[PDB]
Structure formats: structure tokens, C-alpha cells
Design a protein around this ligand. Structure first.
Ligand SMILES: Nc1ccc2cc3ccc(N)cc3nc2c1
Lengths: 171, 176
């Protein structure tokens, strides 16, 4: 379990910045040899799908830790947003690398975990499930802004304002 | 000519096939284009070459579509709606190519995507009575567009997606 964790953390750290990195680069960052990675993940796709699952699990833990239904909605959503942003740009990688969510099993797993965020967005309230889509869309813009080196506070403010007001105001 | 037509056939086949089968082999795309694997390799020697070409082509379509929407004609709300429609109509292949410069670590493709990418921002800013960090509006627009492509794969009707994107841009989703 420790070695598996070292490998997946190294994959997160490395692929977030260098999405085409060799398995050698990932092994080195984990403090292990290539054969080690191979023993757990025979093919790159194996590693990438394990990585995705691990990232989703960390995302779900951060949601539970943020405790979205506890206390005032504004402060609660900010806790959620801050801790999702702390995952970093690996999230963009996992959602956009074509071979990852192409697996139907993993795609189904990915649909599970954000029910409490949806509750809170519902409480503070559009086609079916649109609000949920918009929230994660704003999160996506947030990850890209973080990628540009924008400070977490300003991203969180931009997301919260976008949730309540959108980005333009029509005459 | 023949080569131009063949190139367009391969790209058009890639746009359809990869939107539903993101891991499809180059040979599978060849078959969908009605050409031999041998022929496809004279156009794109490796799959990754086709992926970069497709991404260029889609960015091209995106630019032509914004132009075709006459983004500055008439009431700004109706104009913005035309722009949204124009991009929604590109289809779910946009989900495949959006983050591709990053995915492929291809700064050249990133530079390609840059060209024309301020027009949407001009359209948004000139439809707004107020004044967010650099690039925020652009990124939100495209994130919402992709929520749109996803909703569309999930059976949401075009007109309803356009209404939702428009409402999200101009008013958000919650009240605190
Ligand atoms: N673009 C999207 C769409 C739906 C999503 C659903 C999620 C559920 C749980 C979780 N931890 C993260 C999620 N991220 C999503 C991102």
C-alpha cells in the first residue's frame, strides 16, 4: 500500500506538469525503479486509470472534510472550492486524457461523491443537473487559473462571484 | 482536388469517430473515411499527427463560426446567443481537442489556439454593463460550452442548452 501510494503520488506530481512524462520520470519521483511501477501497473493505461481513481478518491475525501451542509452556505462553498483547488492541475489531466474516462466502469465511479455539494447548490437555488455542471465548470476554469499561478484567494472569489452573478450583466 | 478532398474526409471522419470512441486507432478512422490505412499514413504518419491536425481544424471551425454569427450585429443579447449557438454546433469533438496542447505538451498547438481567442472576450465585454482576473471570462465561457456538449450527449435539447448557457453567463446559479 505504501509503495502503491508513492507511485500514484509521484504520478500526480509529475503528470500535472509534464503530461507526456516517461514512466521512468514517474518511478524516479516515487523513489522506485521502473520494474516496481511495472509490477503494479503493467501498462501506462493501467497506471493512468489507477491514478484517476486515486485522484477521485482524494477529491471525495476533500468534499467530506469540507462538510458542505455544515454552517452558512457561503463559507461552506468556499471550503469546498479551496480544498478542490488544492488537488491542482492533475484534475485537468484526469478529465482530459482520452484513455482514462474511456473506461465505462471508471466513468461510473467518477459520477459518485458530490451529492452534498449538489444539496447545498439546491438549497441556495434550469435543465436536469445543470447547476451541478456549472459548479464543476467553474472549478475547471479555476484549475486553469491556478495553472497560470493566480493566487487561491482570487480564484475562490471569482468562482463564488460567478456562482451568484455569472460573468456578465445584460442591459 | 483529390488530396484536399481526402484530407477533409479523414478529418471529418476523425471528428465523428473520436467524439464517441476517444481511443480509436488511426486505421479505424481510415475505414470511417473510406480510405486505406496505407493512404491515411501518407497524410498523417502517426496517430498523434492526426490529433494535432484535427485540433487545428476544429479551432479553425470555431473561428469561422464566430465570424458567421455576425457577433456585432443588432441587440447584444441576441448576438451573444448566436455566438453560443455557433460554438455549440461544433459538437462534442471540442471536448476531445480543448486541452490537447497541454495533454500533448505541444506549445506550437497552444500558439495556434491563441489566434482569434480574444474575439469571444470582446463579445462578452461588449455585452456587459459591468467589469475578474485575466482570462477568467474566456475560461468560464469555454467551461460552460463544454458543460453544454456534455449535456447534449446526455439528451438535453439544443435550445434548452443554449438557454442554460445564456442564463449561467448572465446570472449564475445560486443566491447567497
Ligand atoms: N465536470 C465534472 C462533472 C461532474 C463531476 C462530478 C463529480 C463528483 C464527485 C467528485 N469528487 C468530483 C466530480 N467532478 C465532476 C466534474
Amino acid at each position: 500500500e505504501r509503495t502503491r501510494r508513492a507511485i500514484l503520488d509521484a504520478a500526480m506530481l509529475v503528470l500535472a506538469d509534464h503530461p507526456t512524462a516517461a514512466l521512468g520520470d514517474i518511478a524516479a519521483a516515487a523513489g522506485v525503479g521502473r520494474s516496481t511501477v511495472h509490477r503494479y501497473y503493467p501498462e501506462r493505461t493501467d497506471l493512468l486509470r489507477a491514478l484517476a481513481r486515486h485522484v477521485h478518491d482524494l477529491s471525495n475525501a476533500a468534499i467530506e472534510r469540507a462538510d458542505p451542509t455544515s454552517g452558512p452556505v457561503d463559507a461552506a462553498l468556499r471550503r469546498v472550492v479551496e480544498s478542490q483547488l488544492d488537488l491542482g492541475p492533475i484534475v485537468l489531466f484526469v478529465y482530459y486524457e482520452p484513455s482514462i474516462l474511456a473506461d465505462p466502469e471508471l466513468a461510473a465511479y467518477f459520477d459518485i461523491g458530490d451529492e452534498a455539494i449538489v444539496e447545498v447548490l439546491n438549497r441556495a437555488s434550469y435543465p436536469p443537473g445543470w447547476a451541478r455542471r456549472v459548479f464543476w465548470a467553474l472549478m475547471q476554469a479555476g484549475y486553469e487559473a491556478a495553472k497560470d499561478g493566480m493566487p487561491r484567494h482570487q480564484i475562490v472569489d471569482a468562482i463564488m462571484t460567478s456562482l451568484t452573478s455569472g460573468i456578465i450583466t445584460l442591459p
